[PDB]
């Protein structure tokens, strides 16, 4: 009764299938759910959290806390460069092991926009100015303070603000073909008497609201 015809694909085990399954313990009532705080629906909720960037990743300081501190030096040096890096998460060693970097290495294609945040950790009596400049992907890094001023920049006065936030629009993956950010001494740091000498900058990276990821893969870290 009920004539029936087997199609090809019968009696195979496909690893990605979504069929019903017989339960092995039908006479069993599961424990009811408890409202635990902190439920996660989506991995973008983890990527949209700030985490500290190891910018000072040079030889000798890779297992100390000194990797996280940008070394602002004292004196009059009002044209030199403070730091510079490309904005390439998932690939570049600066951004590779952050909270945003670890999530991006489970996916093969991703694109979105990034929020950077800089914090000056000096004494309350220090004042001075910095220049934060952004070059788009395709453009070269600036070589002086003057041609960095001729691009997109912002002048940050640490005597009036302790922090400066920066949103970067065009981010994706595939000798860089990526944008970069550099910082330049506009003035130099001025102190009164009886203060510490050196000062430090820290950096935080996060992801803005629109961020897309595709093609779940294996992670290349273990």
């Amino acid at each position: 009764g009920l004539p029936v015809m087997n199609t090809p694909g019968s009696n195979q085990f496909l690893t990605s299938d979504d069929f019903q399954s017989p339960s092995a313990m039908p006479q069993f009532d599961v424990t009811p759910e408890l409202n635990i705080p902190g439920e996660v629906q989506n991995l973008m909720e983890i990527a949209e959290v700030d985490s500290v960037v190891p910018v000072n990743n040079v030889e000798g300081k890779l297992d100390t806390m000194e990797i996280y501190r940008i070394p602002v030096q004292s004196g009059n040096h009002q044209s030199s460069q403070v730091f510079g890096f490309q904005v390439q998460p998932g690939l570049d060693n600066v951004f590779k092991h952050t909270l945003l970097g670890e999530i991006l290495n489970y996916y093969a294609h991703w694109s979105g926009s990034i929020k950077l945040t800089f914090v000056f950790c000096g004494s309350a009596m220090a004042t001075g100015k910095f220049l934060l400049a952004y070059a788009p992907p395709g453009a070269n890094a600036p070589k002086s303070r003057k041609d960095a001023m001729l691009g997109t920049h912002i002048i940050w006065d640490v005597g009036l603000q302790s922090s400066c936030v920066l949103c970067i629009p065009w981010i994706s993956q595939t000798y860089t073909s990526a944008g970069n950010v550099t910082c330049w001494y506009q003035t130099g740091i001025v102190v009164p008497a009886g203060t510490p000498t050196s000062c430090s900058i820290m950096c935080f990276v996060s992801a803005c609201n629109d961020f897309s990821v595709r093609l779940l893969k294996d992670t290349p870290f273990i």
């Binding site: 313990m25 069993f28 408890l34 996660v40 890779l62 595709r214």
Partner: protein, 222 residues
């Protein structure tokens, strides 16, 4: 939408590959055995360490192959082999040999299967008197650190269903595991250390990230 929790975890993997014989002189090589903990498959382990408490159903498919020994005897005309696959809930009896009475108890769910057919499959509910499983536990059992008694989830035993004085063959089982209806709580930072053992969180100190030339170094634009 591909970063949803369900698409990130509801995926199959091989977790155990054992071998077992029809006749031997060891009596532990006559059946196959696996304790079911979620800390001994390195595939799913690192993906679960992003969360503190998890709750899911489990789906298990089996792939079984056989061969005849190259010892002495050819010209056989054997019928297809039968296999018994027994699941033990947390708190059931454990066999010691293949001839034990515990293979016949009415409360261990068991599957009988003969070769040539579709691969076998059963499903497990959330079996815990608590309200969620625990990926992390800071404390004692009652005394082993890190281990509690709410993550008991059971065992799996496999043997041949021959008669008396059988023919010598050796079989192999692959167990494929897959979680369904997954819910997670309290996200954690990823594991920046290679796993050492399958019970603790022990490690060796590793560097935070990789080095570069200087703090100003940006590679040349193509």
């Amino acid at each position: 939408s591909e970063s949803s929790i369900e698409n990130f975890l509801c995926r199959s993997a091989c977790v155990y590959m054992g071998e077992y014989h029809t006749t031997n002189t060891d009596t532990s090589k006559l059946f196959a055995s696996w304790t079911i903990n979620a800390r001994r498959m390195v595939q799913m382990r690192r993906k679960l360490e992003l969360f503190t408490y998890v709750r899911f159903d489990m789906e298990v498919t089996f792939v079984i192959t056989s061969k005849q020994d190259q010892g002495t005897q050819l010209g056989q005309d054997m019928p297809p082999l039968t296999h018994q696959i027994m699941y033990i809930p947390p708190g059931g009896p454990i066999p010691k040999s293949v001839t034990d009475y515990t293979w016949q108890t009415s409360t261990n769910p068991s599957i009988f299967w003969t070769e040539g057919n579709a691969p076998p499959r059963m499903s497990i509910p959330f079996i815990s008197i608590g309200n969620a499983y625990s990926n992390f536990y800071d404390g004692w059992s009652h005394g082993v650190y890190g281990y509690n008694t709410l993550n008991h989830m059971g065992q799996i035993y496999v043997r041949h269903v021959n008669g008396s004085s059988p023919l010598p063959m050796t079989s192999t089982v692959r167990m494929y595991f897959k979680p369904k209806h997954v819910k997670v709580w309290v996200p954690r930072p990823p594991r920046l250390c290679q796993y050492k053992n399958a019970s603790t969180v022990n490690f060796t100190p590793t560097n935070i990230t990789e080095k570069r030339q200087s703090i100003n170094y940006i590679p040349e634009t193509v």
